[PDB]
Amino acid sequence: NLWVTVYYGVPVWKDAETTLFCASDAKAYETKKHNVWATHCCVPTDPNPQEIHLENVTEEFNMWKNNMVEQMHTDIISLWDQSLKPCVKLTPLCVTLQCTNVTNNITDGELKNCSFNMTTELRDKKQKVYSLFYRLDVVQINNKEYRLINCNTSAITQACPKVSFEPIPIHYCAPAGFAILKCKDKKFNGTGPCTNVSTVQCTHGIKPVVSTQLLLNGSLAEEEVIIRSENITNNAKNILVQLNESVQINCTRPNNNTVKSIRIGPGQWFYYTGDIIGDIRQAHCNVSKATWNETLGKVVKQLRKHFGNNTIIRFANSSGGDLEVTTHSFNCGGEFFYCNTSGLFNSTWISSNDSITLPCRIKQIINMWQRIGQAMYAPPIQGVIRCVSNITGLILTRDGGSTNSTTETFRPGGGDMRDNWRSELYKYKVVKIEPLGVAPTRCKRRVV
Amino acid sequence: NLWVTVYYGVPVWKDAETTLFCASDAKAYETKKHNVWATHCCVPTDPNPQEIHLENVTEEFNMWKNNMVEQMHTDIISLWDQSLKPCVKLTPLCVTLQCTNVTNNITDGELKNCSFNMTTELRDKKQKVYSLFYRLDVVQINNKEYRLINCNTSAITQACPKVSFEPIPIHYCAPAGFAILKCKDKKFNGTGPCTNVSTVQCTHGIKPVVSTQLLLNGSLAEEEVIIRSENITNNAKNILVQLNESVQINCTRPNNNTVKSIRIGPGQWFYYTGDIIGDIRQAHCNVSKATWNETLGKVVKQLRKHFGNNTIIRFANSSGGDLEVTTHSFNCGGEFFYCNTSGLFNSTWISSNDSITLPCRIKQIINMWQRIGQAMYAPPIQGVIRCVSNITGLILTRDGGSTNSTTETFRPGGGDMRDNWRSELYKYKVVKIEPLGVAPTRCKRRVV
Amino acid sequence: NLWVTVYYGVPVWKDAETTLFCASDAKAYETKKHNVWATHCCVPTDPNPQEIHLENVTEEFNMWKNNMVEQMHTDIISLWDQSLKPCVKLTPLCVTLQCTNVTNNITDGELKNCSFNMTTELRDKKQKVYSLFYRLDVVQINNKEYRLINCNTSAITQACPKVSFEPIPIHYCAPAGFAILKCKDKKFNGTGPCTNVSTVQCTHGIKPVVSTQLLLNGSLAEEEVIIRSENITNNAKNILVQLNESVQINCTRPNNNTVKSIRIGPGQWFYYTGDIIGDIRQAHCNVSKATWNETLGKVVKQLRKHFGNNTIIRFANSSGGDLEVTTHSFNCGGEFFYCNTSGLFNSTWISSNDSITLPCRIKQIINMWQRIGQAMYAPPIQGVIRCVSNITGLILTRDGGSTNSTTETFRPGGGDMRDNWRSELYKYKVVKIEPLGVAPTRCKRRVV
Amino acid sequence: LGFLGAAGSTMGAASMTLTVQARNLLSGIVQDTHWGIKQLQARVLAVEHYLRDQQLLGIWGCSGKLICCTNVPWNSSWSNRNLSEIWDNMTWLQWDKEISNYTQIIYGLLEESQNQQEKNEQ
Amino acid sequence: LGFLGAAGSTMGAASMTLTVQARNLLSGIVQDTHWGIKQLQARVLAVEHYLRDQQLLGIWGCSGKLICCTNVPWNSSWSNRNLSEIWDNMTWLQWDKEISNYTQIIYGLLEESQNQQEKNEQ
Amino acid sequence: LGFLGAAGSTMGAASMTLTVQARNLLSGIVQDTHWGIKQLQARVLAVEHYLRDQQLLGIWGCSGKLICCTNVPWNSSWSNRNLSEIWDNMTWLQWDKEISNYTQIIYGLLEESQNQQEKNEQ
């Protein structure tokens, strides 16, 4: 007595993977800021991004299988490489160097004073160039003989000095036929059902900040510190900790540099460090002590909800590996800092700022995203650099190998950039709209 | 008593911007002429381009806001750069040169006899190359020391000698969903209504001639000389003058050259000027005097319609700037001429040919479209070059700063290539077809 | 009394040209084999490629006008060039060489022992490199002076040593809207009607084997040897002979090489021949004599069906030209062999294996597809190479110039790679589906 | 009269050639290096426009017709012009300008009316 | 209620907004360097999905309707749920899951029924 | 019989599978480096062909049917073959060849007849 009735425009959906649009929200002018995040992502945002609450809709989310993470990862790497494509190559720098130690009021053999025969715009002429290098970029060959560290492995290019990499918020938007579901559950831990779901065509803006060990300038958790992981008991997985408060970090590169430049080919401008005005000081970052102490105490209180309130939680520094992994790596003013975070993790919890200072190292030859291949040369920045960042979260790992002593050890591990995007994208899922479907009705087609 | 009736296929349109197709009209064989204007633009034309007159249709045009100008500009630059992409680079020429003056029957230190150590196909061997250069391409470094002028700024590449840049007429065609409206009003001045409008799918063919100050080989006005500008009273705007007659210009490069070539790498053929057979003569262009005199007298008669018939109009030469702006620049037989047009503008109008000769300079290193960047090296052409061009128009500017003395001054200014395309494209506008619409009718849908 | 009735979804088609999809059939892992035929062609095949027999359908085929041949040709060349695009350039090898003869137990001045000043990762350092070359890759300049043969013509690049070019079967599949018709007539000679036709969405897999004169590893004819040509009587056309049996050929490069490598730039690894362990032996290929003799006897029996059974058929070797044409060229283990096939064609037919050995030459600098342009450098392979191939067919040409003596001469000519793809693709044709059409019916539309 | 031949005709007469324009919307059927990407984008865009208009005719119940009547009454606020001037003196170009601020109103009314009709048909 | 505003509504009520979703399938109408190729691919794909669904409605005889009845009877093996629960308590999201293994069955039946009807109409 | 299974069948019998071919025209739904641009072009082209044919069915008044009758009479100049041979002995492949010079004539007649019908329906 019932027949099939076909309905079109039915509000249902299925999990799907697709390509999202990149929108800038007009925070920068492509032609005035020359910001790589403004160019390419030139699509404007919706000035009135009306969100639609879905009443009585329950949906499941999984941040660890969320395809948006891969999409962000691929697009960032591509943007970066495209941005450096037209810049001056520095392969003429793979020459031997004659180097000595800096003749200044220095306390820590961090800086090398090197000279070399560099090319000029004419093939018949060479020029003597004198510059300072940080020791991490320069290695020995055998008034001593040195070469740049990248020369036995890959080509090195100069970042264009006119191009900014400063992140701006980026909004991702669904292509027509797709929609983005946002989970508003304040306690959402990255997986399972969420009963507070709304639909948007675009995500909020996320700044593509690269920061390895500590999550900087991200969003904050509301109400409580939230600890999320793929598997609580798997010591091979990272733990992403989102704070509900922020910690300010003051990072400085105090040496006042004079930046010099030469032509090394036909319009091929090369920038170098010149020399240092004043005395020599070590780069470093400052965190208020009380703030840091409370921050971890809160993290411990929450970790205990997974391991037991009768447990002991200790923090320790990096276990070992390359600086890109063991130190806190971030971009501050165009400069690349590698800070010694061991000063932050020397504490155990059991049942007038006095800021902690982390010494930092500086590198000019940068291998992005743990790739073996071309290196980027970061030109020096004229003057002195200072910035203040917000720690909004941490990446922790456990050693494992536990004998159930309850004395578990956590370290500032991880280092895989996908996790620093996952930490924001966890709120969103993308689905495909499936408008066609059927249901029984007490209706039959007129018979013909 | 009236209801909405929906009609589809309604013959209406709106102003729009889109991308046009490039059609060749088969004037050249891609594989026999190796003409850059034949390749890429390989779409054939309509052998029967039926035009449709629109009876009783009034439409407005604006040549100064016509998007087709930008489309032509972008496509020409791209074609040019793609065409040179696979050609031999001449960066090995940025070497010092030893130069003297030409040892010939020369009256005007125009030519430099230079020698240098050039590369060969093997890295272990160098060769001595002797060639002549025009002084405009060669500058001093400090038997005197010289370098090529581009070497402190940008890479230089050789135009492939096998590739022709000779313009052929190009037709632009609308993509489906769009149409081109052509204005036939004989007095159309570039803006406002036109009552004689027809629709075509393609424009007529326009030759993409590059000519700066004088408009060459374009179309002629009918009936009267037409003077068009964005703003008559704005001295910051150019005045485009379209003649209703033509002036023939005979341009010659009389020196008989022997062209030589060497390998400077693995199949990397380089061409150079060799030497000159016979005596040395200055490049120049000839215009009949009476013709030129009448040509400007007609222009003055028409300029007075905007400034007053009681005014005084004087012509003067270029105000200053680079040769690419101050001289008349054009491509004649592959060679690049920079002619001194001051000989054409030394006259004031108030209430047996005796041809005027304009001396010309020759350059081999060419910076197209006022860009700072890569330069094109124009290889020399074996023998002697002569061509005859049609002046079909002029670009004039006013000095302004007038005190209403009525003695207004006009100069052969401008130099922005977009204007030399605007001068032909002014007849066409592109619109989008909007086939769907409604109107009241005394008809109601059968009620169900 | 009849009216037009319109039918949609009508099973008819027309000859058409389109683009086909490349499917791998998962015979290799892109990431484990690094096979160029697995990457790019990553589309999976249909695990159940149901074929549809067309009952009572007669269709005409023409292998000589079959667009699939051109499609395969273009795609193979492109794949090859894309595959070599990221590899190390060897232009620093265009240096002079000092060479002597190999100091070993060699009987045939095939190998040259050369030394040269090669680049290093630093611009200030050079290194002495010693390597052996086959004489075909090295030419004289004037302890004797030599250069690589390609240096006066084009750039040379190194094939990436990690990349395999070993062919795997490739299936071509129609895009939606198109279908492929397969002819099953056992006697199909390449042209005219076929009454046994089925429709498939994909062709069977064809291995893209490059083999010039002899067709290797292809399919076999059933029942009889089939001789196909565009024109039997045109001596300017090739004759493709498909065997209904196979001949095994054992090809070896017996010299045991030690392969060495150096950096010649920043990660720019270069491979060279090092030296030879043991004595020196000539590369060669073995074919059983009886098998070869029967193979040609069968070919003759069939050739006589076109020329007369009272004729005399003789086989002769190549008429002349470059090794790429006159010898049998193939890829065996990554190595490039040029074998002297004259040993196979020294016989006339009229009304304990004792294998025939063909001496072979080896080349490292390879010009693919008779193009003038970049050469590929085939790195040497560590150890000793042996492979066994299946001759599945031959390319023969006639001398022509006949005086009707009946003593016709056939040679292993041709050499155009398109023919070695045509030899497999002849079974397939692609057509466009034309679903819309009309027919008379005794039906009129309800009148309104 | 050919494509847009009726552009200057009055609305009544112009309706006689509606098939002329309809057939020129998919004419693109006859018509890497960026030259290729630009042409491909143009083709995709033409398809999208065709479908957007066809979808609206679908939504309004006129998918199969060049001319269709609906159940939505005409508002004098859109136009109070004499019906005879609209069909005999006015052209479609003029008309589109005359009621240009109402297209989105009329379309919304058409969407609602058709949806109500289908609700009732079930 | 806006796009997908009815997603949590029961099936009966949800049908009141079918035009809301239909109009958001071709919204791409408002929306070389590989950034360009990716966007172009997305646009083409959206068109292909639209057409595939529209073709099925065509094949089943419902090309011009948001809601249409057919001649294919409902199987209790698909669902034996009370008709009133289906329209008043159940939502479309739940429903799709409930009968998800039958979509291809129902579609095959619709194709056959419509083809038979047309055969008989001739 | 499967796709084109009816290709050798006579016209009458062949009509029994019209849905088989119709569903294989948009099968592309299941199916920078120039490899990508070539595939994308193929997809766009398939869409354009689909729409061009669908538009004609629209124009002729047969948008929703696999089989439809019109008001245009059959010309003996196109074919004077016995109706029974046309449906029982002849195949569609043969038929297309038989009347191949008239497709554009028939289509023009269909366009005119449908436009006249709509004019009169208003």
Ligand SMILES: *[C@@H]1O[C@H](CO)[C@@H](O[C@@H]2O[C@H](CO)[C@@H](O[C@@H]3O[C@H](CO[C@H]4O[C@H](CO)[C@@H](O)[C@H](O)[C@@H]4O)[C@@H](O)[C@H](O[C@H]4O[C@H](CO)[C@@H](O)[C@H](O)[C@@H]4O)[C@@H]3O)[C@H](O)[C@H]2NC(C)=O)[C@H](O)[C@H]1NC(C)=O
């Ligand atoms: C977390 O977020 C904070 C901010 O919320 C980031 O810190 C900011 O970092 C940027 C870049 O390092 C700093 O901007 C720089 O400021 C320099 C000084 O500007 C002064 O004058 C302007 C005048 O209006 C004031 O607005 C400004 O506050 C200062 O008073 C500029 O000289 C720098 O310009 C450089 O880039 C431009 C780009 O085109 C070039 O043209 C210039 O020549 C030059 O190269 C730049 O503007 C900003 O001040 C910082 N904010 C604060 C509060 O310090 C953190 O870095 C971020 N954390 C992470 C990890 O990213």
Ligand SMILES: *[C@@H]1O[C@H](CO)[C@@H](O[C@@H]2O[C@H](CO)[C@@H](O[C@@H]3O[C@H](CO[C@H]4O[C@H](CO)[C@@H](O)[C@H](O)[C@@H]4O)[C@@H](O)[C@H](O[C@H]4O[C@H](CO)[C@@H](O)[C@H](O)[C@@H]4O)[C@@H]3O)[C@H](O)[C@H]2NC(C)=O)[C@H](O)[C@H]1NC(C)=O
């Ligand atoms: C305004 O328009 C005029 C023409 O209306 C242009 O002047 C023409 O310019 C072209 C190019 O500079 C000239 O063509 C050249 O002619 C040379 C001599 O050809 C003679 O023999 C042929 C045989 O059939 C005759 O047809 C011809 O009239 C002459 O008698 C050729 O040698 C040149 O060939 C070069 O290019 C080809 C391209 O592939 C190469 O293969 C050759 O090796 C060689 O490089 C060329 O054909 C043409 O003659 C000029 N016309 C006149 C009347 O002089 C103006 O230049 C144009 N104005 C502007 C500003 O562009």
Ligand SMILES: *[C@@H]1O[C@H](CO)[C@@H](O[C@@H]2O[C@H](CO)[C@@H](O[C@@H]3O[C@H](CO[C@H]4O[C@H](CO)[C@@H](O)[C@H](O)[C@@H]4O)[C@@H](O)[C@H](O[C@H]4O[C@H](CO)[C@@H](O)[C@H](O)[C@@H]4O)[C@@H]3O)[C@H](O)[C@H]2NC(C)=O)[C@H](O)[C@H]1NC(C)=O
């Ligand atoms: C006609 O078809 C025949 C086969 O039907 C082809 O001959 C084959 O050619 C391939 C390539 O030249 C040969 O494969 C090579 O074998 C070497 C030895 O492998 C031994 O051990 C494996 C272990 O499982 C056995 O399976 C195998 O049979 C042998 O016992 C390998 O070392 C070679 O590897 C190379 O390539 C890989 C690719 O990533 C690299 O990683 C390696 O480092 C190395 O470079 C390779 O596998 C194959 O054995 C041949 N078959 C026979 C029977 O000899 C003909 O060449 C073909 N004709 C033409 C003209 O193409």
Ligand SMILES: *[C@@H]1O[C@H](CO)[C@@H](O[C@@H]2O[C@H](CO)[C@@H](O)[C@H](O)[C@H]2NC(C)=O)[C@H](O)[C@H]1NC(C)=O
């Ligand atoms: C790095 O080395 C350079 C080279 O010796 C030092 O520059 C020299 O400083 C002396 C000091 O009077 C001058 O007389 C020389 O002329 C300078 N050389 C040049 C090339 O200018 C430089 O000071 C050293 N820098 C540091 C920080 O040690």
Ligand SMILES: *[C@@H]1O[C@H](CO)[C@@H](O[C@@H]2O[C@H](CO)[C@@H](O)[C@H](O)[C@H]2NC(C)=O)[C@H](O)[C@H]1NC(C)=O
């Ligand atoms: C440009 O300079 C070259 C180099 O000196 C001149 O060529 C020489 O001319 C003399 C004249 O007898 C010869 O003996 C030399 O052998 C020539 N040199 C070479 C390298 O061939 C050349 O004539 C000068 N050209 C001009 C125009 O001044």
Ligand SMILES: *[C@@H]1O[C@H](CO)[C@@H](O[C@@H]2O[C@H](CO)[C@@H](O)[C@H](O)[C@H]2NC(C)=O)[C@H](O)[C@H]1NC(C)=O
């Ligand atoms: C190719 O030439 C090289 C260079 O002379 C030969 O290598 C030398 O062999 C002698 C033999 O005792 C050694 O003493 C030298 O030290 C070797 N030179 C180097 C650079 O190692 C090489 O043997 C020759 N190879 C052949 C096959 O003739």
Ligand SMILES: *[C@@H]1O[C@H](CO)[C@@H](O)[C@H](O)[C@H]1NC(C)=O
């Ligand atoms: C700098 O001083 C340190 C002190 O131990 C020494 O090891 C190093 O070699 C010196 N480097 C140079 C370049 O003088």
Ligand SMILES: *[C@@H]1O[C@H](CO)[C@@H](O)[C@H](O)[C@H]1NC(C)=O
């Ligand atoms: C340049 O090369 C010379 C070798 O001739 C060397 O002595 C000199 O130190 C080099 N210059 C520099 C600055 O290294």
Ligand SMILES: *[C@@H]1O[C@H](CO)[C@@H](O)[C@H](O)[C@H]1NC(C)=O
């Ligand atoms: C050529 O002669 C002029 C004459 O003034 C002189 O200034 C110039 O330096 C000379 N140039 C060379 C290269 O001899």
Ligand SMILES: *[C@@H]1O[C@H](CO)[C@@H](O)[C@H](O)[C@H]1NC(C)=O
């Ligand atoms: C090798 O020996 C042959 C023998 O004729 C001789 O011609 C050739 O020049 C020799 N080559 C070298 C490089 O010694």
Ligand SMILES: *[C@@H]1O[C@H](CO)[C@@H](O)[C@H](O)[C@H]1NC(C)=O
């Ligand atoms: C390197 O160049 C020198 C010239 O200074 C030459 O004597 C030597 O033989 C070259 N080395 C080799 C291996 O050819």
